[PDB]
Each structure stands twice: as C-alpha cells, then as structure tokens.
Amino acid sequence: GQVLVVADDFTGANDAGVGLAQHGARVSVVFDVNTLHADLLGDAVVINTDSRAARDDVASQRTAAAVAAWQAVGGKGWIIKKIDSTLRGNLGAEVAAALSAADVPVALIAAASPTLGRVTRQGEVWVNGRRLTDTEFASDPKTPVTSASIAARLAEQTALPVAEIHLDEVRQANLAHRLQQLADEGTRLIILDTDVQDDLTHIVNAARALPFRPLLVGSAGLSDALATAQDFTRKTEKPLLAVVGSMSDIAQKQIAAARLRSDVTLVEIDINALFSPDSSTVMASQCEDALKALTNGHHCIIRTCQQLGETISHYLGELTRSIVQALLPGGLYLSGGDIAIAVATALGATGFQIKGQIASCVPWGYLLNSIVGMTPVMTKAGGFGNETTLLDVLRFIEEK
C-alpha cells in the first residue's frame, strides 16, 4: 500500500508529491534518508537524490541508499524511480541501482507525460512533434541529451538487457503475459511506448497483474497513473457541512458532481415526511447521519427532495442547530438565501462578516455571535454558479 518515489531533482520530487497528494495520499519529501522511520511511510515518501549532474557512481549509490533506507524501516508497496521526461541525467546508473535494490526481475520504463507533450514512439521520446534530439532540451548547458532512444541513453551507463514494447503491443489485453515472458527470458529493463494517459493506466494495470511488483520508472505521467491505481481513501479532518434547500436544476447538478466523490455523503430530507408526528425521531436520525459522515472525514451534504418553503427553512435551521450542538464541521455552506438566513438565525448569529467570494458566486466569511464561532460560512443564491461550484467550495475547505 505504500509508495517510495526516488527522484533526481527538486522538481521531479515535488511533481511526484503533488500528484500523490492530489490523489488522496499522505505524502512527504524527506530531506535526508537518515530521518526516515516507519511512521513516515504511510502513504508515500519522496526522496530527492539531487544527482542529475552528479558522477554516475554517486548517483547510483544515492539511489540504492534511498531504496535500502525505505526497506530498512518496513517499506513495502511500489517503488517509482522518477526520471526527466526529456531524458537528462544519470538514467542508466540510477535505474540499475534502483532495480538492484528493489531486487525484482524487471523495471518497467514508461517515460511519457502526454499531457505535457512528451510521448514515446518506437522506443524514442518525441516532444511536441519532433524527436528529442531535434529540440532545445538536447542543447546543454549541464546535461546534453545525445539520443531520443531510451535504450541508447540507458546503454551509456548500464548493460542490463533491455526490450522495447511498441504502441500496438502495449495496447493488447495480454500485456502482463508479455511482461512476464520477458522477465522469464532474462530481460531486465522493459521500455514501453505511450501516446495518451490511457496507455499509462493500462501499463500500470499490467504491472499490478504480475506475481511481483516491478520497479516503475517514469516521469509525471507514470507517477499520476500509479497514484490513481492506489485508490487512496480521501479523508478530510474538518469537512464541509452543506445545507441545500434549493430545488433548482443547477443545484442538483452541483450536488451530483460532489456526489460522484468517495468522500462525500448525502443526507436526504424528504419534504413529505415533515408533517408526520415521527418528524422529531426522523430529525434525530438525520442528525446522527450527519455526525457519522463528518466524524469519519466525509463532507456531508444535506438536501431536500409560500409556507412550504418556510416550514422547510425552519426545519433545516433546526436540524443544523441540532448537528452543531451534538458535535467540526470545517465549514458551513448554505443555499439558497432563505436557508442561509434561517440557519444563521437558528445558530444565534446577528450578522455575517463577508471576507470574500468563492467561484465567482459564493460569498464566504464568518457569522457574528453564533454558536459556530469562527467556522467559515459560505452562502449561495439559488440558480447561481455552474456544475463545479460545490466542488470549488469543497476544495476551499480542504485547503482552509
């Protein structure tokens, strides 16, 4: 379940860390492997060997040492050796060291970052329409690149046997069988074409179907694909409590988009069940439902499905007050205007100090004199925004 990233510079290390963090991981860059310990392993560790311009033997020793340090404290899961997408650096020395340390039959080298314009075709890196050696990245002034061929570049520093798998063969359903075959034959480095991100997904899927964990070697593209495949559980410490009484079409869209997420829980309030005498019992249950969501790190969205609107606004005001007294949350989002004022009033607020706005239509700030203290509060008028407005509020609370 754990990931080790070994990068040869600052930017590679950051890009890896950011990708893992965006996909739910607890991730840190550790400056000296001698501060590595077991509690730092979950979910990902990133080490910068700062070896892009170093001697090949130093680059190799540092890469090997990073892997061994992670293993020594109980690291087990996936190791990715991050390389320059434009093939600068001590590629062969570092890949060989990482593979030796990993002690598995093969490394999968899938270097492409398609969304950044780097692809691999017949074993060679192309950048925006040209082979790598036909671009500026091959023009020094620290690490000149003398070949677009990944094999040729590796061969400058390691004689490990290699094999290329070009794009049509990559895309076959039986890729994992082909990888195993190459491993069985004594191939050590397998270099894979890639044109789009789906190719890297497929490659990681094949990697995961092997009876061992191969070393992974790539740039941002492979790192992103690995991060996705880990399926990290998204958990925010102080999540949003959202109370939505708008029946408008755009609110359904906004909520649906949030609903797609695995860290979002809906509590649905039936309007019809508001007039039965068990309404109190049912409210207590909705309240309990909200608590469980928030205490387990899920954003919680409460939503409904003349005097009607008023009975509804009062009830949600009452439920929200109930939830606050039972408790978190990291923020409170209220929509539309009727809900906002009913809920704020129910929380004893005398006003709303506005600090700014989110997503061009969600005022945010703090309620004054209310039982939620300095909890950020957000509002939105009915009908406003687009499909991702609630997603934008979620991100705001997560970053808090």
Nearest to 226 by CA among 207, 206, 204: 204
| CA atoms within a 13 Å half-sphere pointing along the CA-CB vector of 215 | 28
Solving technique for this entry? X-ray
- Burial of 165 by CB count in 10 Å (0-12 exposed, 13-18 middle, 19+ buried)? buried
DSSP class of residue 113 equals B
d(CA 243, CA 334): 5
DSSP string, 228-296: HHT-PPP--SS-EEEEE----HHHHHHHHHHHTSTTEEEEEE-SGGGSSTTHHHHHHHHHHHHHHHHHT
- Choose among 359, 382, 373: nearest CA to 238: 373
Give the three-state DSSP class for 327.
coil
Task: Tell whether omega for the bond before 239 is within 30 degrees of 0, i.e. cis.
Answer: no
**Is residue 338 reached through a cis peptide bond, with omega within 30 degrees of 0 on the bond before it?**
no
Q: Write out the two tokens for 15.
A: 């890009």
* Residue 64: other Cβ atoms inside 10 A: 21
Binding residues: 9, 52, 82-85, 246, 336-339, 382
Interatomic CA distance for residues 381 and 357, integer angstroms: 12
For 29, phi then psi, to 5°, come to: -90, 130
Residue 82, sorted as left (phi over 0), alpha (psi -120 to 50) or beta, turns out to be beta
Strand partners, 79: 4
Which structure tokens are listed for 91?
A: 């590629």
For the chain, how big is the Rg over CA atoms in Å? 26
Amino acid in position 120? T
Helix locations, the chain, DSSP H = 10-22, 56-72, 91-102, 150-155, 167-170, 175-185, 197-207, 220-229, 249-259, 279-295, 307-326, 337-346, 389-399
Query: Which residues are annotated binding-site positions for substrate?
Result: 9, 52, 82-85
- What resolution does the deposited structure have, in angstroms? 1.9
Q: Is 139 exposed, middle or buried (0-12, 13-18, 19+ CB in 10 A)?
A: exposed
Whether the link from the prior residue into 221 is cis, omega within 30° of 0, is: no
CA dihedral 335, 336, 341, 342 (to 10 degrees): -80
Instruction: Report how far apart, in Å, the C-alpha atoms of 212 and of each of 44, 179, 180, 248, 396 are.
Output: 19, 11, 10, 52, 40
Burial call 107-134: b when 16+ CB within 10 Å, e when fewer: bbbbbbbbeeebbbeebbbbbeeeebbe
Annotated binding-site residues for ATP read 246, 336-339, 382
178 vs 191: CA distance, rounded Å: 12
Sign of CA dihedral 213, 219, 223, 225: negative
In angstroms, the CA 344 to CA 356 distance is: 18
SS3 183: helix
Contact, 201 vs 175, CB < 8 A? no
Query: What amino acid occupies position 164?
Result: E
